[PDB]
């Protein structure tokens, strides 16, 4: 039937990464969530007129299990590499996440998007030009998202699905 896309969210912990998938999968208009319920990470969507199923792996909270990253990453067809726009270290981590994805998938051309996430009102420390330059150096899209208003969230996931479709 319809295509299923296995997407994997990766990025530094402690800086609001989980809000991306929560806001997508959520009842958009009721701020509530039970992550334990079967298929709280599956969503049927229509992208460019074509219906598909998103299966999203977000292991937020398990960042210290660093030797499990390879196994988790190998499940994915496309990757959202997320940093927080007020945490420069999370931005500097992106290079190593991308290198690890390429190694795990054994490919120099893995569908991925760079996501800059605004997780609070603390001062931005990564300017959008810096992130655009990094994304261009990798040949991948850059999307900025808000962890509170849902802005950019659909764009981040839909852009990644388009990267998979056009691979």
């Amino acid at each position: 039937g319809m295509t299923e896309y296995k997407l994997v969210v990766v990025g530094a912990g402690g800086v609001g990464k989980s809000a991306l998938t929560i806001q997508l999968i959520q009842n958009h208009f009721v701020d509530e969530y039970d992550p334990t319920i079967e298929d709280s990470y599956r969503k049927q969507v229509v992208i460019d007129g074509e219906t598909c199923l998103l299966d999203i792996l977000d292991t937020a909270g398990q960042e210290e299990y660093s030797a499990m990253r390879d196994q988790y990453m190998r499940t994915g067809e496309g990757f959202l590499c997320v940093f927080a726009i007020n945490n420069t270290k999370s931005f500097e981590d992106i290079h190593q996440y991308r290198e690890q994805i390429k190694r795990v998938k054994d490919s120099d051309d893995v569908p991925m998007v760079l996501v800059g996430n605004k997780c609070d009102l603390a001062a931005r420390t990564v300017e959008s030009r810096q992130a655009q330059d990094l994304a261009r150096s990798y040949g991948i899209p850059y999307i900025e998202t808000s962890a509170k208003t849902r802005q950019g969230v659909e764009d981040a996931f839909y852009t990644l699905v388009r990267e998979i479709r056009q691979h």
Partner: protein, 469 residues
């Protein structure tokens, strides 16, 4: 009719329930949201006990109430005014007779004594199971000691004297089985010869047993204080979540040790023996319900350095391929089969903690702290109940001890394992991947031959236990 209550002007916990101060979920009621006053009223309700609510509240309240303020509020709850004499009592007293005081006696028996006892039960649970509040705030402990130590009146006396003693014991602070643990098993390394201990020289049964004892102890040491508020992800994680981090770092170190044992065995035949032995350890982990250990092995086999070793995988016996594949399938589809298996086994077990961490974090991030109703902000208690359901599951598996004997030298060997040495993580994991490329080069580069490195027999003793008399 119902008992009359003190005036809400002298006693705040007698205000009537309304949608402006408490909201229930759709046979005791389940609270969705409320003011802190209403939550404390229901925590100590005169009509029923709610021990699950006491645990939920004491586990999660610091997200909406400070410890000092909680103590003030339950002392306020405790101090219930008694009603004045009724008209019939007044008429008796005016005639020089003793009043029946029927309404006063009922209010004491059915309101004051149950509420006061349930306040003391909150104090008892607070001290026994959440004593960290008092370890971190000595003045809070003084206030609790003073409150308990000055409760008068004989109805509460047994519990007041008991709680005083429990506090004093907690300030200065044994397992029985009916069966004996099985005999410790030995292989090439003999007792006391710690210098020869290694993956292939210790008995694989005993490796799995001693790692299970170690990992069980690490699992059992994690308290809810390390979890609520997602504190293990925040900047002070080393201060607030040290037992959790020790447990995770053990798991990571063992996974990396398995990877290192595999890729530093350059001879193909010897490396097949190494991988086969690790799968036998995995089989004993499964038999012991040590799911942390199962996934430590699975994570190593699916790591980038090991996963690509097709020549090694080809020579693994088919029965061991099936053991590894069944273990891998536990994690597939967001751990569907793992979750079902955990809920079906007979403990003791060692759960994989990572799923709990993700669910606690997402519950906290995905639900609001307050609900706005009729211009009021109510504490979203349903969110706290969801977190405490997870911490309660964790605690349920922390109770059952393993009936296995510790071997102090094998325990020390695994406690001191340090596969990364002084290297940083990226340097070390690049080293492992480069070793993988060395021992099984990318096609079309030819497969080299390498000399043997082990001088002792590679044959496994197997994982069925032995039993001499």
């Amino acid at each position: 009719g119902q008992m009359r209550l003190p005036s809400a002007d002298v006693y705040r916990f007698a205000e009537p329930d309304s949608e402006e101060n408490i909201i229930f979920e759709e046979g005791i009621p389940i609270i969705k949201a409320g003011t802190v006053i209403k939550l404390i009223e229901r925590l100590t309700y005169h009509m029923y006990a709610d021990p699950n609510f006491v645990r939920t509240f004491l586990t999660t309240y610091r997200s909406f109430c400070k410890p000092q303020e909680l103590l003030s509020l339950i002392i306020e709850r405790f101090e219930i005014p008694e009603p004045e004499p009724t008209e019939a009592d007044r008429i008796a007293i005016e005639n020089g007779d003793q009043p029946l005081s029927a309404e006063l006696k009922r209010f004491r028996k059915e309101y004051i004594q149950p509420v006061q006892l349930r306040v003391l039960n909150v104090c008892r649970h607070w001290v026994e199971h959440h004593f960290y509040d008092f370890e971190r705030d000595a003045y809070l402990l003084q206030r609790m000691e003073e409150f308990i130590g000055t409760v008068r009146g004989k109805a509460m006396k047994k519990w007041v004297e008991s709680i005083t003693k429990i506090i004093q014991r907690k300030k200065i602070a044994n397992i029985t089985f009916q069966s004996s643990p099985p005999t410790v098993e030995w292989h090439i390394s003999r007792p006391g010869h710690i210098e020869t201990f290694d993956l292939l020289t210790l008995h694989p049964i005993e490796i799995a047993r001693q790692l299970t004892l170690l990992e069980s102890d690490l699992y059992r040491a994690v308290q809810p204080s390390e979890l609520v508020g997602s504190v293990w992800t925040k900047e002070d994680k080393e201060i607030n979540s040290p037992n959790l981090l020790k447990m995770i770092r053990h798991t990571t170190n063992l996974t990396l040790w398995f990877e290192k044992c595999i890729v530093e065995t350059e001879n193909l035949e010897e490396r097949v023996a190494v991988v086969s032995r690790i799968i036998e350890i995995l089989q004993v982990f499964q038999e012991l319900n040590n799911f942390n250990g199962v996934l430590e092995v699975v994570s190593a086999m699916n790591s980038s350095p090991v996963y690509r070793l097709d020549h090694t995988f080809e020579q693994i016996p088919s029965r061991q391929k099936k053991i590894l594949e069944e273990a891998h399938e536990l994690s597939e589809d967001h751990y569907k089969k793992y979750l079902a298996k955990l809920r079906s086994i007979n403990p003791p077990c060692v759960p994989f903690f990572g799923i709990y961490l993700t669910n606690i974090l997402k519950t906290e991030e995905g639900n609001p702290e307050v609900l706005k109703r009729h211009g009021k902000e109510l504490i979203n208690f349903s969110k706290r109940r969801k977190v405490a359901e997870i911490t309660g599951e964790i605690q349920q598996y922390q109770n059952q001890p393993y009936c296995l004997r510790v071997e102090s030298d094998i325990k020390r060997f695994f406690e001191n394992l340090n596969p990364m040495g002084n290297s940083m993580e990226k340097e070390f994991t690049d080293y492992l991947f480069n070793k993988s490329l060395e021992i099984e080069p990318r096609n079309p580069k030819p497969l080299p031959r390498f000399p043997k490195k082990y001088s002792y027999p590679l044959k496994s003793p197997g994982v069925r236990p032995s039993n001499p008399r």
